[PDB]
């Protein structure tokens, strides 16, 4: 059921865990207004897909992982198939074209 991600070596290892499941996540901070928009919706999805994997990444824990993904703003949406991104999403988004997104991606 979604897993916060603290340090750069925990993506790997929560990726580890994701397989052939697609993985959408999310790059935040407690200072990230927009971000605290997508947590909720974020997290139904998780629920409402019971296939893909959720996590959550704050880039105040994981400012190891950003810089070698070279990410830069938030809300960022990254989407992750098989240990390496399948795509990559900057800025918040409704709850339609966050699903409509994954669900073009999620195969």
Same mark, same amino acid.
């Given at each position: 059921?979604?897993?916060?991600?603290?340090?750069?070596?925990?993506?790997?290892?929560?990726?580890?865990?994701?397989?052939?499941? %697609?993985? /959408?996540?999310?790059?935040? #901070?407690?200072?990230?207004? !927009?971000?605290?928009? @997508?947590?909720?919706?974020?997290?139904? *999805?998780?629920?409402?897909?019971?296939?893909?994997?959720? %996590?959550? /990444?704050?880039?105040?824990? #994981?400012?190891?992982?950003? !810089?070698?993904?070279? @990410?830069?703003?938030?809300?960022?949406? *990254?989407?992750?198939?098989?240990?390496?991104?399948?795509?990559?999403? /900057?800025?918040?988004?409704?709850?339609?074209?966050?699903?409509?997104?994954?669900?073009?991606?999620?195969?």
């Amino acid at each position: 059921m979604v897993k916060q991600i603290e340090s750069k070596t925990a993506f790997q290892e929560a990726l580890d865990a994701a397989g052939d499941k %697609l993985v /959408v996540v999310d790059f935040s #901070a407690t200072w990230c207004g !927009p971000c605290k928009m @997508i947590k909720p919706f974020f997290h139904s *999805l998780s629920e409402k897909y019971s296939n893909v994997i959720f %996590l959550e /990444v704050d880039v105040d824990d #994981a400012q190891d992982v950003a !810089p070698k993904y070279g @990410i830069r703003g938030i809300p960022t949406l *990254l989407l992750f198939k098989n240990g390496e991104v399948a795509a990559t999403k /900057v800025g918040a988004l409704s709850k339609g074209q966050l699903k409509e997104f994954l669900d073009a991606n999620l195969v």
